[PDB]
Amino acid sequence: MPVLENRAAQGDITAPGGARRLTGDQTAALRDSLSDKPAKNIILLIGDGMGDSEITAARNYAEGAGGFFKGIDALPLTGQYTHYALNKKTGKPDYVTDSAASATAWSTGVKTYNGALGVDIHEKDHPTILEMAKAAGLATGNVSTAELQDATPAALVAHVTSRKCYGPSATSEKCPGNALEKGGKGSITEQLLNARADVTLGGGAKTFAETATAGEWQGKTLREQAQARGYQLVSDAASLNSVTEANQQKPLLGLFADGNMPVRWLGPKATYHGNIDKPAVTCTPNPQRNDSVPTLAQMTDKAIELLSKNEKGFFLQVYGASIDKQDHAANPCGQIGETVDLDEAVQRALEFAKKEGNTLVIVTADHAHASQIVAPDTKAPGLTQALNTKDGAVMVMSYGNSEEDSQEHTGSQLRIAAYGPHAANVVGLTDQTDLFYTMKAALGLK
Amino acid sequence: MPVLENRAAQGDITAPGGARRLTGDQTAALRDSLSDKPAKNIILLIGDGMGDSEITAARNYAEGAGGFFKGIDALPLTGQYTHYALNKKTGKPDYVTDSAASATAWSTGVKTYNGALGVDIHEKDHPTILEMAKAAGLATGNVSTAELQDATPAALVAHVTSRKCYGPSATSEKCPGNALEKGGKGSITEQLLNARADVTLGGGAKTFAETATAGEWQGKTLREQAQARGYQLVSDAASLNSVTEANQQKPLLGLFADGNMPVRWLGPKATYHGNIDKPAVTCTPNPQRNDSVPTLAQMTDKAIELLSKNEKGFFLQVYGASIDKQDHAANPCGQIGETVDLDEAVQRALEFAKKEGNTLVIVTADHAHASQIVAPDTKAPGLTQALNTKDGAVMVMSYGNSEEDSQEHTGSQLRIAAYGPHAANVVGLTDQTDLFYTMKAALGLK
Ligand SMILES: [Zn+2]
Ligand SMILES: [Zn+2]
Ligand SMILES: [Zn+2]
Ligand SMILES: [Zn+2]
Ligand SMILES: [Zn+2]
Ligand SMILES: [Zn+2]
């Protein structure tokens, strides 16, 4: 099955046919991309807040308008899906979801309320695709640039009523019903340790410094619990490489930062009348990011290699958190840089899949976001910034949906794209929950 | 080849599987959607400013979040395409296009600068797909809820350096090199009369009141001219319905309004803090629109009847302008209503195509727009409004990208969908110009 080799503009964009991305008819090549054979592996890549506009802005800046993401843009089967959440009290649609509800949706197959992790609107637990994978004998991986306790990674391993229940302290106070000392399954972190995925890599070391309030590991910090349970812990890139295997006897746990992992690019925050009162911006490397912090692609690399040892097959989720976070912060360089970061991850996934031949790879976002690409002389009410793109032309981005310190999600349907066995089930209009069922059937779970 | 019968949520939105839009594997159905046989006809439907946000908002309001547009959402082959224009000076990408430049792109195959109709940056004319269709002996249809002189319909029949050149008067003044008496092909309206499509339906009667300055019909209004040339003139639903034939001996010219055609729904204009300071809004029918003004679907249906008599085939463009126009006015009900207007037209096209068997139907937009779907509690700097949706829940829409009297286009990539012969060529990432060549190839033109 072919990945889209090259869909950059094919010539002189000012000349007839110069901006075409197609070189000929696609029918045959699409037919060739459609298999219903069983998937042995799935790699699900999530870019948080990566709506169609975030992809465009990032392509525009880093690859040029007629450029082409070698990962993100290279998946043959594309569609649009809906990620609306629910009002907890009414059961009716809540048109703009948070990470919690949407991640719960694709990892569980049931809609839920903003803030909910692995539970429906009645607070009843539902099994996650990762838990099911592990039970079928599949190897499991969970990779994240956010705190590991954050909604998206957490949704695969924890069941709680609020996403705020990082550790024992927060749980006892906000999810009393989940608190270990109250007869519940426990905090997000405690539940993560129980879930015992083969590979788990992200930030969020801070919460492992808490002590459990009850259970076999009462009195001991969550970190020591992990150690007492046979987890290999690594804290940087070098130590990550030293790892040789990863399984139920020696699960891998990577903690690469206190909270969220550092972002790659630095640029000023967008600003009111920024495009007209402030110079065009060119992004730069983040000085606060040490080489020894692994990159999403580097984590994705190591996970694929460790997980693929498993003959039955593996399931892996790759989560680029800070597109969304930088979008919230109205920071275009931060936001574009993390989109570029995800694209590298996708490339590693795509080329593994391309050689193995029985791997379904999926790329999407949890929901849309604020950033808009607007005309250079725009006079907008929100925060704006002008950027010098690879094309040698300025692009203006606008963030205009919040007066407070944080720009807001949007509810627009958005792109989902796939390559490999069962990738068809992503085409046309679908819903976020269909995704859970697509993965379930592909791996032949249950 | 199947049209997506139903991709609404399949059951209880609150229960596992209840929000699924799919009932099973799509591979087989998708395989049956891929044919590379000749297209006898092509119906291109354009929603002006109908980006993914606009589609989702219309769906949310009129059909409910888990609802389904029987037209818009029912095309199996989907992808995202880019519509960047060109800076006329530098030849580099201008990241946010207008109607002129983007409609020039698909109808012609070449990128151009904002405001240009059927000419490249060098201002050199290029042939449009409709002129090419007519040349190949095919019937041609050009339908529009906007003024017929407006960029999108005009791009098929006129070549001018500025979209402003409605009639001789404005042409002589702003496109002298195009002015008839300065020896040019003439104004948009004069060129429209020359082009002589079999069917031309829209608004814009005002400009036909103008008199030509030079040429064979000097002194006579373009209305009179159209008549001397053998055009059948209709101006309301009943007269249009009465028409029995439309061809090169008797081309049909429908003029249903002075300017743009009247909007379908009425609602208040969005407002600063409108979602918090003012009551949720329910859209109502426009009490000013006369029943005798044809709808987009009514025009589309009649065009199809008339055009399908040609045994070689037909090309037909159907343009829903007031989505964009209401988006500019920050009027959610206007906007949504026009999206509903478009969805009906798409249905008429889909149902004709589904039984004719050899028709390619395409639905997309020229570019994205301002309107965003945001959380009900949002405090934004721009204009907002709360809506009572079909779900009986409230949706908030935000227009936050302009301090001027008009909301702005956005450069985000956006959905293109297709059904029928050669539809494969829409899947994945493409460019607006690819659409020219896709159509061109599907009709075996040249
Ligand atoms: Zn040139
Ligand atoms: Zn998110
Ligand atoms: Zn967020
Ligand atoms: Zn229920
Ligand atoms: Zn437009
Ligand atoms: Zn517009």
Helix (H) or strand (E) holding A317: strand A314-320
Tokens of A421: 């066995």
Task: Report all structural domains of chain B as residue ranges with CATH numbers, in order of start.
Answer: 1-446 (3.40.720.10)
Q: Which of B16, B34, B378 sits opposite A401 (nearest CB)?
A: B378
Amino acid letter, residue A407: Q
Distance from A300 to chain B by nearest Cα, in Å?
Answer: 24
DSSP letter (8 states) at residue A17? T
Closest residue by Cα to residue A64 from A1, A107, A25, A19: A19
Say how far apart CA A296 and CA B346 lie, in whole Å: 43
Say how far apart CA B309 and CA B250 lie, in whole Å: 14
Distance of CA A328 to the CA centre of its chain: 16
Q: Which of helix, strand or coil describes residue B274?
A: helix
Q: How many CB atoms lie within 10 A of CB A242?
A: 8
Chain B residues whose CB is inside 8 A of the A53 CB are 368, 410-413
From A439, which residue of chain B is nearest by alpha-carbon distance? B25
- Please report the DSSP string for B134-171 in residue order: HHTT-EEEEEEEEETTSHHHHTTT--BS-TT--SHHHH
HSE on the CB side for B50, CA within 13 Å? 29
Beta bridge partners, B359, equal B41
Contacts 24+ apart (CB under 8 A), A166-173: A166/A204, A166/A207, A167/A207, A167/A210, A167/A222, A168/A210, A168/A211, A168/A212, A168/A213, A169/A210, A172/A213
DSSP letter (8 states) at residue A425? G
Closest residue by Cα to residue B299 from B316, B322, B323: B316
Amino acid letter, residue B134: K
Tokens of B327: 């988006």
Beta bridge partners, B260, equal none
Contact assessment for residue A402 and residue B402, using Cβ atoms and an 8 Å cutoff:
no
Tokens of A95: 């048109």
- Cβ-Cβ contacts under 8 Å for A121 (sequence gap 6 or more): A86, A88, A91, A111, A112, A113, B14
Q: Which of A7, A368, A427 sits opposite B76 (nearest CB)?
A: A427
Tokens of B441: 């190839």
- Cβ-Cβ contacts under 8 Å for B355 (sequence gap 6 or more): none
Closest residue by Cα to residue A323 from A310, A333, A314: A333
Alpha helices, H only, B69-121: 99-108
**All residues with CB under 5 Å from ion ligand 2:** A 48, 99, 324, 366
Beta bridge partners, A221, equal A211
- Cβ-Cβ contacts under 8 Å for A289 (sequence gap 6 or more): A262, A263, A264
- Cβ-Cβ contacts under 8 Å for B4 (sequence gap 6 or more): A428, A429, B73, B74, B75, B76
Q: Supply the Cα-derived Rg of chain B in whole angstroms.
A: 21
Q: Are A109 and B414 an interchain contact pair (Cβ–Cβ within 8 Å)?
A: no
Q: Are A110 and B16 an interchain contact pair (Cβ–Cβ within 8 Å)?
A: yes
- Of how many residues is chain B composed? 446
Tokens of A123: 């607070």
For the purposes of burial, counting CB atoms within 10 Å of the CB of B318, is it exposed (0-12), middle (13-18) or buried (19 or more)?
buried
Closest residue by Cα to residue B306 from B225, B245, B387, B397: B245
Tokens of B88: 């006329």
Tokens of A422: 């069962």
Contact assessment for residue B369 and residue B53, using Cβ atoms and an 8 Å cutoff:
yes
For the purposes of burial, counting CB atoms within 10 Å of the CB of A137, is it exposed (0-12), middle (13-18) or buried (19 or more)?
exposed
Tokens of A132: 């099911």
Which is catalytic among the residues B33, B35, B53, B99?
A: B99
Say how far apart CA A279 and CA A119 lie, in whole Å: 48
Say how far apart CA B240 and CA B256 lie, in whole Å: 10
Cα angle B96, B99, B105; round to 5: 85
Contact assessment for residue B384 and residue B269, using Cβ atoms and an 8 Å cutoff:
no
Amino acid letter, residue A218: Q
Q: How many CB atoms lie within 10 A of CB B342?
A: 33
Phi and psi based region of residue A372 (left: phi greater than 0; alpha: psi -120 to 50; beta: remaining): beta
Chain A residues whose CB is inside 8 A of the B401 CB are 372, 374, 378, 380-382, 398, 400
Report in angstroms the alpha-carbon separations of B176 from A158, B169, B304: 70, 10, 37
Q: How many CB atoms lie within 10 A of CB A244?
A: 9
Closest residue by Cα to residue A113 from A132, A130, A128, A94: A94
Say how far apart CA B36 and CA A27 lie, in whole Å: 6
Tokens of A47: 């870019």
Say how far apart CA B36 and CA A20 lie, in whole Å: 19
Tokens of B351: 């149902």
Say how far apart CA A110 and CA A299 lie, in whole Å: 29
Query: Could you tell me whether strands B199-203 and B139-147 are parallel, antiparallel, or unpaired per DSSP bridges?
Result: parallel
Tokens of B280: 């949720």
- Alpha carbon of B106 to ligand 1 centroid (Å): 18
Place of tokens 């001789």: B168
Contact assessment for residue A102 and residue A85, using Cβ atoms and an 8 Å cutoff:
yes
Say how far apart CA B112 and CA B105 lie, in whole Å: 7
Contact assessment for residue A50 and residue A318, using Cβ atoms and an 8 Å cutoff:
no
CA pseudo-torsion sign A372, A376, A382, A384: positive
Chain A residues whose CB is inside 8 A of the B427 CB are 26, 30, 76-78, 427
From B422, which residue of chain A is nearest by alpha-carbon distance? A27
Contact assessment for residue B104 and residue B155, using Cβ atoms and an 8 Å cutoff:
yes
Distance from B424 to chain A by nearest Cα, in Å?
Answer: 5
For residue A122, give the ligand nearest its CA. Answer: 4
Helix (H) or strand (E) holding B436: helix B432-442
Say how far apart CA A432 and CA A154 lie, in whole Å: 17
Amino acid letter, residue A229: R
Chain A residues whose CB is inside 8 A of the B30 CB are 34, 424, 427
Q: Are A16 and B110 an interchain contact pair (Cβ–Cβ within 8 Å)?
A: yes
Say how far apart CA A121 and CA B278 lie, in whole Å: 30
B99 counts as catalytic: yes
Q: How many CB atoms lie within 10 A of CB B427?
A: 29
**Alpha-carbon torsion, ordered A29, A30, A32, A37, to 10 deg:** 160
Q: How many CB atoms lie within 10 A of CB A280?
A: 15
Beta bridge partners, B201, equal B143, B254
Distance from A131 to chain B by nearest Cα, in Å?
Answer: 16
Phi and psi based region of residue A61 (left: phi greater than 0; alpha: psi -120 to 50; beta: remaining): alpha
- Of how many residues is chain A composed? 446
Contact assessment for residue B267 and residue B330, using Cβ atoms and an 8 Å cutoff:
no
Say how far apart CA A323 and CA A396 lie, in whole Å: 17
Chain B residues whose CB is inside 8 A of the A422 CB are 25, 27
Say how far apart CA B128 and CA B151 lie, in whole Å: 13
Tokens of B143: 């339908």
What is the stated resolution of the deposited model, in angstroms? 2.3
Query: Cα(first)–Cα(last) distance of chain B, in Å?
Result: 27
